[PDB]
Swiss-Prot record, chains A, B, C:
It comes from Homo sapiens. Residues 36-55 are annotated as: Disordered. It is found in: Cytoplasm, Cytosol; Endoplasmic reticulum; Nucleus; Cytoplasm, Stress granule. It is linked to Inclusion body myopathy with early-onset Paget disease with or without frontotemporal dementia 1: An autosomal dominant disease characterized by disabling muscle weakness clinically resembling to limb girdle muscular dystrophy, osteolytic bone lesions consistent with Paget disease, and premature frontotemporal dementia. Clinical features show incomplete penetrance. The modification N6-acetyllysine is found at K82. Necessary for the fragmentation of Golgi stacks during mitosis and for their reassembly after mitosis. Involved in the formation of the transitional endoplasmic reticulum (tER). The transfer of membranes from the endoplasmic reticulum to the Golgi apparatus occurs via 50-70 nm transition vesicles which derive from part-rough, part-smooth transitional elements of the endoplasmic reticulum (tER). Vesicle budding from the tER is an ATP-dependent process. The modification Phosphoserine is found at S30, D98, S103. Phosphorylated by tyrosine kinases in response to T-cell antigen receptor activation. Phosphorylated in mitotic cells. ISGylated. This is Transitional endoplasmic reticulum ATPase. The PIM (PUB-interaction motif) motif mediates interaction with the PUB domain of RNF31. Belongs to the AAA ATPase family.
Amino acid sequence: EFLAKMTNGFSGADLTEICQRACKLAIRESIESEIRRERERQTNPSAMEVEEDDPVPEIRRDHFEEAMRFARRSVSDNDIRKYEMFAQTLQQSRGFGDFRFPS
Amino acid sequence: EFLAKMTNGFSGADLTEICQRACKLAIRESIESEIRRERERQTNPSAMEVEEDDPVPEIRRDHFEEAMRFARRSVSDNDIRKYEMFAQTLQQSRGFGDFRFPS
Amino acid sequence: EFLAKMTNGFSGADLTEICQRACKLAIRESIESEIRRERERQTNPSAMEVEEDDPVPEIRRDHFEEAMRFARRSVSDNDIRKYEMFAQTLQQSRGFGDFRFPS
Amino acid sequence: HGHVGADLAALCSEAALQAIRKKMDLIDLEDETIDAEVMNSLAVTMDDFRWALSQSNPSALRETVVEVPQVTWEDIGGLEDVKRELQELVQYPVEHPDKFLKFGMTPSKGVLFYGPPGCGKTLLAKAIANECQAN
């Protein structure tokens, strides 16, 4: 809900991108975390993690906090006024307005 | 390294040309040096070079020092600003910037 | 001399600017160094610098090394060709060339 | 480049015939029946192959060719951000295809380079193909 009312003028195809940028930003760290775990210097059987450590099991908070920095609204204000102007080109129930039948 | 930081605004397709101009400038001198060696006046068997003299066995320093004089940058400054301007046409993570989730 | 042959296409009014940017970048540090010297916590007469310490007595090397980062050539290549083209609009001793008086 | 197997058989035969044809000083008209000297004592040398390659043998190939390139990453140094980005967009959907299925991110299907003309675009695009061992 806090991510909802912060993105204000964003189109529906723009905030569907940041929930892929955050997934890419977490897959980068989950690939990179497995590099050091196999590249342990003197990788000895002593004190070995027989259990999977799972450093990134799910998308955390700072992935969205970092993926939000590259957000950009695609539609401007100058072109939404074009569709509002076409909506005004439809006469939009304007003219006389209310009248009543006689009694 | 001294030839690296001297060529500053050169594109990757321009300095690949001077390492062919220097090769052409050394092949010219290696062709020309064999002309006088067969055109020795009174070419006698006395004091004959039975060994190959090899005047240009490899590209020397002054070939690059002479081939550099015909260098020319192909891309100007007025057209790299066009690609920078298209990079600015992408919104480039500009707008609100940093925000944080509440605690 | 190393600063001479590095700035290649720079006009005479552009490299007269970096020897003021470096002076401004050293005056900033010489103003800032006097702030901490009067703002010493428990500024006691013990171990007092009776001599002037003079942290920046002259422009050092890294001031030029940092002031060079903001350099920009003002004249492009597209406009120096205009003056070369006007120099070619003067006919520039072209035509017949060498002739000799008869003997 | 462009030769097929029959063209290479023709190249071998033409090089052997050029090595025969240079030995006409012994293969003469006076000896119609050829003696057993040159029949087993003639070996082909390298300039015969260069002659038979250069003077003849037009290649019968004009269409595309599939291969792994042999350019390397240090052939164009720098651009570490571009190297990290191309690694994230090519290597990881194929070297680790299960982690892309753990949290459902679909892979992208292509980037678009753009820049000044002639700054090593193809020599950069072939590098990830060589690194991934990809055609």
